[PDB]
Each structure stands twice: as C-alpha cells, then as structure tokens.
Amino acid sequence: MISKRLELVASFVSQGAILLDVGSDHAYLPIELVERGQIKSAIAGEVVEGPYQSAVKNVEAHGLKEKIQVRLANGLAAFEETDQVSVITIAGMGGRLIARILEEGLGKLANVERLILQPNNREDDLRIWLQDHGFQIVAESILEEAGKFYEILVVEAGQMKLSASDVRFGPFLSKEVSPVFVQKWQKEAEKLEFALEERQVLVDKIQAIKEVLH
Numbered sequence: 728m729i730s731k732r733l734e735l736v737a738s739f740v741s742q743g744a745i746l747l748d749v750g751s752d753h754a755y756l757p758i759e760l761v762e763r764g765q766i767k768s769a770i771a772g773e774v775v776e777g778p779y780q781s782a783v784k785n786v787e788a789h790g791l792k793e794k795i796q797v798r799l800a801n802g803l804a805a806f807e808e809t810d811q812v813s814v815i816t817i818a819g820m821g822g823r824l825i826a827r828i829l830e831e832g833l834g835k836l837a838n839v840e841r842l843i844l845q846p847n848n849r850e851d852d853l854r855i856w857l858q859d860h861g862f863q864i865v866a867e868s869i870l871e872e873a874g875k876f877y878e879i880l881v882v883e884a885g886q887m888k889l890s891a892s893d894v895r896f897g898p899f900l901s902k903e904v905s906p907v908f909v910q911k912w913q914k915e916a917e918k919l920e921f922a923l924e925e926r927q928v929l930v931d932k933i934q935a936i937k938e939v940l941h
C-alpha cells in the first residue's frame with residue numbers, strides 16, 4: 728500500500744518514537760508507522776483545510792482516533808514541548824520551505840532526537856541552512872520513483888563543516904556513491920552540456936559532477 732519513498736523515510740524512524748509529521752497529507756506515514764507498532768503515538772499536522780480534513784478522516788477510518796492527533800497548524804506550530812515529540816518527519820516539499828519551517832520554529836527543536844527530511848529540490852540550500860544552525864547529517868538515502876529522484880536527509884543535534892561537494896551532492900550519498908546517485912547526476916550532467924563567459928557556471932558544475940562520479 729504505502730509509497731516506496733514514504734517507505735524509506737519511515738525506515739529511519741526511531742523504533743519507539745513519538746512522531747510529528749509536518750504536512751502529512753492523508754496521514755499515510757504516521758498511519759503505517761502506528762499500524763506496525765514502530766512508533767508509540769503521533770501528531771499529523773497540516774497547514775490548510777483541504778489536507779487537514781483528509782488527514783482527520785483517514786485517521787478515523789483506520790480507527791486511530793486515540794493514537795494520532797491532527798492539527799491545523801503551520802509548520803512546527805503543530806506541536807508544543809509538552810507533546811514530547813522525539814522524531815519529526817518533514818517530506819514532500821521544497822528544500823527552501825523545509826528550511827523556512829525549521830527556521831521559523833527553531834525554538835522547538837532542542838528536545839527532538841531526530842529529523843527525517845525529504846526535500847523535493849534545493850537539497851544544497853537546506854544543507855547550508857542545516858549546517859549554519861547547529862545541525863549535522865547522520866544518514867542519507869536517494870531513490871527513484873516513477874521518473875522522479877528523491878533525496879532523504881536524516882539529521883541530529885551537532886556540528887558539521889561540509890565540503891562544497893558535500894553541500895551539492897551530499898556527505899553520505901557521495902560516500903557510498905550508488906547507481907541511483909549516478910543516473911541523477913549523469914542525467915543532470917548531459918542536461919547541462921546540452922545547455923552549454925557566464926557559460927562557465929556550467930563548465931565547473933559539469934566538472935564537479937564528473938569529479939564526484941569518477
């Protein structure tokens with residue numbers, strides 16, 4: 728049933744957690760996770776009525792009223808420190824909105840063990856942000872689904888000084904340099920050459936891709 732992307736995200740969720748899933752369409756992720764006993768309880772939070780309603784309903788349907796709360800809230804407003812959240816997933820958004828959300832709610836994060844994040848784009852910018860604000864990446868996955876590529880970033884409390892390669896391609900994605908890693912950046916590399924002395928932004932970009940794949 729559950730999407731293959733949403734599958735990965737779930738797989739980094741600390742066994743026993745209390746989850747907050749920001750932008751939980753349809754509550755699919757907290758729902759599966761509650762169902763397989765991998766988490767204790769959850770909060771699905773959504774920012775507009777459409778999705779909020781959808782999540783409310785699906786939770787009833789799976790009769791999980793007393794295991795998942797659904798809140799119409801914007802980003803981290805969705806919880807307070809009393810909810811005692813251990814893990815937050817934030818999936819299916821732009822890199823920079825993910826940053827803005829973490830940004831506008833940075834306060835709340837001190838007692839949060841882990842942060843599972845699937846940006847849609849702007850993966851680099853998030854990394855710059857995450858570095859600059861006292862977060863370190865502990866784990867990274869990539870996957871293909873139905874044409875589209877999807878980076879997942881697992882994060883904790885910490886310092887990290889990243890290479891400019893590591894911001895662009897990812898600390899862990901370019902360690903174990905997988906096949907899915909390779910088409911992404913390949914596909915992107917020809918996308919570039921296709922385009923090709925501002926015609927120079929590209930050269931080095933292209934060169935960087937050549938380099939991390941080599």
Ligand SMILES: C[S@@+](CC[C@H](N)C(=O)[O-])C[C@H]1O[C@@H](n2cnc3c(N)ncnc32)[C@H](O)[C@@H]1O
Nearest residue numbers: 749750751752772773774778800801802818819
């Ligand atoms: C591409 S969907 C992904 C939903 C789910 N996390 C997933 O990846 O499968 C983006 C969803 O994020 C929701 N969202 C919830 N809270 C948000 C917030 N606080 N700021 C921006 N988008 C938010 C939007 O309403 C929308 O339903």
